[PDB]
Design a protein around this nucleic acid. Structure first.
Lengths: 52, 111
DNA sequence: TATAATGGGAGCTGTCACGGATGC
């Protein structure tokens, strides 16, 4: 996970960091022999696009 | 060599989808589906074999298959995509046949 | 028309002798 932007606020003897983060979470999908992938390597998808 | 369940299902599937694509390409171009199939088959196998087909209403020589292949290549992307589908289906057909050529022997030895 | 099946089987054994085309 990467910190795109970093806003800070001073308050008393501390800072409070409002971090604009960006990061990728994995999910696995098991393929069966009767199935076929419709997507290449490293290809981006959206909500509702067909993988297999 | 013989087909893995995956390789078999894949070649099968591609065949069915190329048949579908020839149907769709007939819908699009208004040409005869059999003529379409023979043209795709011509270019798949090569010029080594092109010959007159009895059901075809037209004599299938390199001149007219070049003409029809050209009028096929003159398609939009989402239509010419069906030409690529049919080509892949023909090649899957030849590979699946040649794969199962040994079943035939094992079956005819009993005849 | 739909479990799944995936490379075959004989062979035939005792002539003799040439000419003429093909390999170390």
């Amino acid at each position: 996970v990467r910190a795109a932007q970093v806003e800070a606020e001073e308050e008393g003897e501390t800072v409070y960091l409002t971090l604009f983060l960006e990061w990728t979470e994995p999910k696995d999908y098991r393929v069966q022999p009767h199935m076929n992938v419709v997507v290449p390597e490293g290809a981006r998808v959206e909500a509702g696009d067909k993988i297999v | 060599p013989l087909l893995t369940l995956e390789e078999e299902v894949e070649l099968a599937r591609k065949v069915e989808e190329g048949m579908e694509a020839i149907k769709k390409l007939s819908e699009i171009t208004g040409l005869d589906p059999d003529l379409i199939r023979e043209v795709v088959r011509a270019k798949i196998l090569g010029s080594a074999r092109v010959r007159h087909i009895p059901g075809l209403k037209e004599t299938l020589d390199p001149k007219t298959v070049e003409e029809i292949d050209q009028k096929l290549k003159s398609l939009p992307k989402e239509h010419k995509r069906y030409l690529h589908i049919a080509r892949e289906g023909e090649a899957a057909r030849q590979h699946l046949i040649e794969a199962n050529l040994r079943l035939v022997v094992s079956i005819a030895k009993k005849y």
